[PDB]
Amino acid sequence: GHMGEEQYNRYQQYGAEECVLQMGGVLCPRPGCGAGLLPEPDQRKVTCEGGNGLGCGFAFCRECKEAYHEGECSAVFEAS
Ligand SMILES: [Zn+2]
Ligand SMILES: [Zn+2]
């Protein structure tokens, strides 16, 4: 029994605040274009394109369901 690690527990608490912030089952936040196509399980690259005449041409971040940013939603990541 060598294994044995831990992760951020009780992540959900009063201190933390979140209003209308989630991923999966999101649609094109653009006006008129109601692309409700289920985005891949990786926000790495999600195009509202889909297929119909809705494709905007600019991928978004399914994580924050907002404009694709070259940074992070909440905070950056690390190997550690
Ligand atoms: Zn769109
Ligand atoms: Zn994001």
Curated annotation (Swiss-Prot):
- Resulting phenotype, C33A: Impairs the ability to ubiquitinate SNCAIP
Q: Where in the cell is it found?
A: Cytoplasm, Cytosol; Nucleus; Endoplasmic reticulum; Mitochondrion
Signal peptide (residue range): none
Glycyl lysine isopeptide (Lys-Gly) (interchain with G-Cter in ISG15) cross-link: located at K45, K65
Q: What is the effect of changing G24E?
A: In PARK2; does not affect PINK-1 dependent localization to depolarized mitochondria
Q: What else is known?
A: The parkin locus (PRKN), adjacent to the 6q telomere is hyper-recombinable and lies within FRA6E, the third most common fragile site in tumor tissue.
- Say which family it is in: Belongs to the RBR family. Parkin subfamily.
- Report what the protein is called: E3 ubiquitin-protein ligase parkin
- State the organism of origin: Homo sapiens
Lineage of the source organism? Eukaryota, Metazoa, Chordata, Craniata, Vertebrata
Gene of this entry:
PRKN
